Each structure stands twice: as C-alpha cells, then as structure tokens.
C-alpha cells in the first residue's frame, strides 16, 4: 500500500516536472502569452509548482542520505515552496476576486510584482518566524515539518485559509459560468476540470482523507497538478500552440 502509493508521486511528479519545465520555457521565452495577468500569475504559480516538485523529489533523494545541515534547508525549501504554491493559489483566487467579484478597479501598479512580494514574501516571512522560534522544526523517512503544532498552524491552517478562499472562489467561478449558461440567448468540461487543479481544489482531498482512497486521490492529483496545468492550460490554449508552431 505504502510503496505503490509513493509510486504515483514519483512518476506523477516526474511527468509534471518534464511537462512543466517546458511550460516555463514556452511561457518565459514566448512573451506573447504573458500579456494578460492570468498568464503571468500562472507562470509564477508554475514556477512555485516546479520548485515544489523538484525540491520535493530532492527532499526524497537526500532522505536516504540525510545530513542535518541539508535536511533543514530541504525541509524548509519544501515548506517554503509548498506555501508559495498555496499562496499563489490563494492569490490566484484573489486575482479572481479582483477579476470576478471585486470586478472593477482591478489595476494595481505593478500587479504581478506586488503579488510576487505576497506569494513569495509572505511564505518567506512565515517560514522565517518558524525558524526564529525553533530551527529544529525541520528534520525527521522523508524531511517534512516534524512539529505537529507548526504543521497545523503554518501548513494546514494556512492551507485551509488558502482553501477557504479557494473554494470560496471556485464556487464563484462555477456559479458565474452557471449564470452564463443560464442566460440562454435564442434558447466546456476541460475548463472547469483544469480550474479544479489550478486553484488547488483537489489539494483539499486531504480533508476527505481525514479514509484510505482519498490518500490515493490527493497524491495522484497533486503529483500531476503541474502536468494537468500543462495539458489544460498550456497544451489546451490555442495561442501557446500557435507560438509552438
């Protein structure tokens, strides 16, 4: 059960890293994609996901050969990159707040960089205040937070906040498309199916696994979340394929 489950995380994250590095190349080098704010916030979310998967996998390569100096950094970079992934999905839902709930006055001067100082800066300062009270919060089979209280307050409670503003906005996008299709004039599953991974709605599959099959669903979907962003938000958009060919 244990080893089969970890198999998807490796294979899933391997495929996600392979199809997400090329996503970051085809977004940073091809400038024409990132004209709008959703593409730029998706680039920095994909950077958060790539440096979550690669460091996450790395946090497992040095799990077999553990050095205390290295564990703390990897555990903290895995924590920092998990919280920048969570904070970029929270700021993703906040971009959907400024685009779909607080619909007008959506301009903030240097919007992407003031989201960079929050999507990376706020995880940096909360990891820093983890470190200034206890450096032993990271260590030991795999290097994760070894402080249950810190894990709940910083990973989970914080993740829950990113979840209680993410399914507070996922239902907003679903009722907005419900309003759009219910406004029938004269009488897409891929879009919502990619939106449930880009906002991290399946990152809340651990709440239903608080059960053994939702461990599989949680792990299987979040190990391929970057892969699904590639196939639903990079390989699916026609402008990216137009820049490809």
């Amino acid at each position: 059960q244990m080893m089969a489950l970890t198999f998807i995380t490796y294979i899933g994250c391997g495929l996600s890293s392979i199809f997400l590095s090329v996503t970051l190349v085809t977004y940073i080098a091809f400038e024409k994609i990132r004209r709008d704010y959703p593409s730029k916030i998706l680039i920095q979310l994909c950077a958060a996901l790539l440096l979550l998967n690669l460091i996450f996998l790395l946090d497992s390569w040095i799990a077999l050969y553990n050095t205390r100096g290295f564990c703390i950094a990897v555990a903290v970079f895995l924590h920092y990159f998990l919280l920048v992934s969570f904070t970029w999905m929270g700021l993703e839902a906040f971009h959907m707040y400024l685009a779909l709930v607080k619909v007008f006055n959506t301009y903030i001067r240097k919007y992407i960089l003031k989201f960079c100082i929050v999507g990376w800066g706020i995880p940096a300062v909360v990891v820093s205040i983890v470190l200034t009270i206890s450096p032993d919060n990271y260590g030991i089979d795999f290097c994760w937070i070894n402080s249950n209280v810190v894990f709940y307050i910083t990973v989970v409670g914080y993740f829950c906040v990113i979840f209680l503003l993410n399914v507070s906005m996922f239902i907003v996008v679903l009722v907005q498309l419900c309003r759009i299709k219910k406004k029938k004039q004269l009488g897409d599953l891929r879009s919502i199916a990619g939106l449930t991974f880009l906002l991290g709605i399946t990152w809340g599959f651990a709440f239903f696994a608080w059960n053994v099959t939702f461990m599989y669903l949680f792990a299987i979907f979040n190990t391929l979340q970057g892969f699904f962003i590639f196939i639903f938000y990079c390989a699916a958009k026609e402008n990216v394929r137009k820049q490809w060919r």
Binding site: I8, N148, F151, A219
Partner: peptide, 11 residues
C-alpha cells in the same frame, strides 16, 4: 514517501 505527508490532516 507519498505526496500526502504535506497535508496530513490528523498526522
């Protein structure tokens, strides 16, 4: 380990 170390709700 599996992905589900990060969000172990009960742990």
């Amino acid at each position: 380990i599996s992905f589900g170390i990060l969000l172990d709700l009960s742990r």
